[PDB]
Write an enzyme that holds these catalytic residues in place. Structure first.
Site, PDB file in Angstrom:
ATOM      1  N   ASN A 120      -1.032  -9.390   4.526  1.00 15.15           N
ATOM      2  CA  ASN A 120      -0.828  -7.983   4.767  1.00 15.15           C
ATOM      3  C   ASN A 120      -0.602  -7.265   3.432  1.00 15.15           C
ATOM      4  OD1 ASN A 120      -0.556  -5.638   6.187  1.00 15.15           O
ATOM      5  ND2 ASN A 120       1.311  -6.221   7.303  1.00 15.15           N
ATOM      6  N   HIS A 167      -5.370  -1.159  11.579  1.00  9.09           N
ATOM      7  CA  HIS A 167      -4.825  -1.667  10.331  1.00  9.09           C
ATOM      8  C   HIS A 167      -5.757  -2.758   9.846  1.00  9.09           C
ATOM      9  CE1 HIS A 167      -1.982  -2.523   7.231  1.00  9.09           C
ATOM     10  NE2 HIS A 167      -1.658  -3.716   7.696  1.00  9.09           N
ATOM     11  N   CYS A 221      -5.007   0.655   3.749  1.00  9.18           N
ATOM     12  CA  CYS A 221      -5.110  -0.756   4.092  1.00  9.18           C
ATOM     13  C   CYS A 221      -6.548  -1.240   4.038  1.00  9.18           C
ATOM     14  CB  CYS A 221      -4.518  -0.997   5.477  1.00  9.18           C
ATOM     15  SG  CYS A 221      -5.166   0.147   6.700  1.00  9.18           S
ATOM     16  N   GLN A 237       0.813  -1.206   0.000  1.00 12.20           N
ATOM     17  CA  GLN A 237       0.000   0.000   0.000  1.00 12.20           C
ATOM     18  C   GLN A 237       0.852   1.263   0.000  1.00 12.20           C
ATOM     19  OE1 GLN A 237      -1.399  -1.212   4.125  1.00 12.20           O
ATOM     20  NE2 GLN A 237      -1.402   1.027   4.386  1.00 12.20           N
TER      21      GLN A 237
END
Length: 212
Positions: free
Chosen positions: A175, A159, A25, A19
């Site tokens: 992630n 997050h 996110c 990102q």
């Protein structure tokens, strides 16, 4: 549900993204659940546009953060374009969905996993990738290089990531910090500790798209 789930082995997970500096996110998270559910229902794996959600989710705050559930409702309401046609620029610009032609894909809705319930989340993950949140600000999470992560971390979730699997002692997380972080971009976070928040608050707020 099985002892092990790994949506990557069923080809429902696209490559790990980065990102960048942007707090996008929430959009990356929502997209991996869209990429997952479209592959599960159509057998086709495509990459979809985080940038479009970034630009077009008026309830979210662009690179200042946002809500996976709002992004997911956007795709349910309007649709989403391919990542190729609407590529990631790492900055919020204006919403350009209409200049990009017809949507590549649409979902039918969004459901919330019952919060603070490990079994509820595992059940959802056995069905499809799920958008989950956790506290990522702690140095231990940021410097994670592999293994089953147990913390330390609190529950100040900050997050959005995607759960794409689980095992007896972990939940498998995609992630959006690029392939150099964690386990080629993934983290396995300990489950089964009887803390109803989850490790790093993982069970706080979880969402998945519905596609009939």
């Amino acid at each position: 549900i099985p002892e092990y789930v790994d949506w990557r082995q069923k080809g429902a997970v696209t490559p790990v993204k980065n990102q960048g500096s942007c707090g996008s996110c929430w959009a990356f998270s929502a997209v991996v659940t869209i990429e997952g559910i479209i592959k599960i229902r159509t057998g086709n794996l495509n990459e979809y546009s985080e940038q479009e959600l970034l630009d077009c989710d008026r309830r979210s705050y662009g690179c200042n953060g946002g809500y996976p559930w709002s992004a997911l409702q956007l795709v349910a309401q309007y649709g989403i374009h391919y990542r190729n046609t609407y590529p990631y620029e790492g900055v919020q610009r204006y919403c350009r969905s209409r200049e990009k032609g017809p949507y590549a894909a649409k979902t039918d809705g969004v459901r919330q996993v019952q919060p603070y319930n490990e079994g509820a989340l595992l059940y959802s993950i056995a069905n499809q990738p799920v958008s989950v949140v956790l506290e990522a600000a702690g140095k231990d999470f940021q410097l994670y290089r592999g293994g089953i992560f147990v913390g330390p971390c609190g529950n100040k979730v900050d997050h959005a990531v995607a759960a794409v699997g689980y095992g007896p002692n972990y939940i498998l997380i995609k992630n959006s910090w690029g392939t150099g972080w964690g386990e080629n971009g993934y983290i396995r976070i300990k489950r089964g500790t009887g803390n109803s928040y989850g490790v790093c608050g993982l069970y706080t707020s979880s969402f998945y798209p519905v596609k009939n």
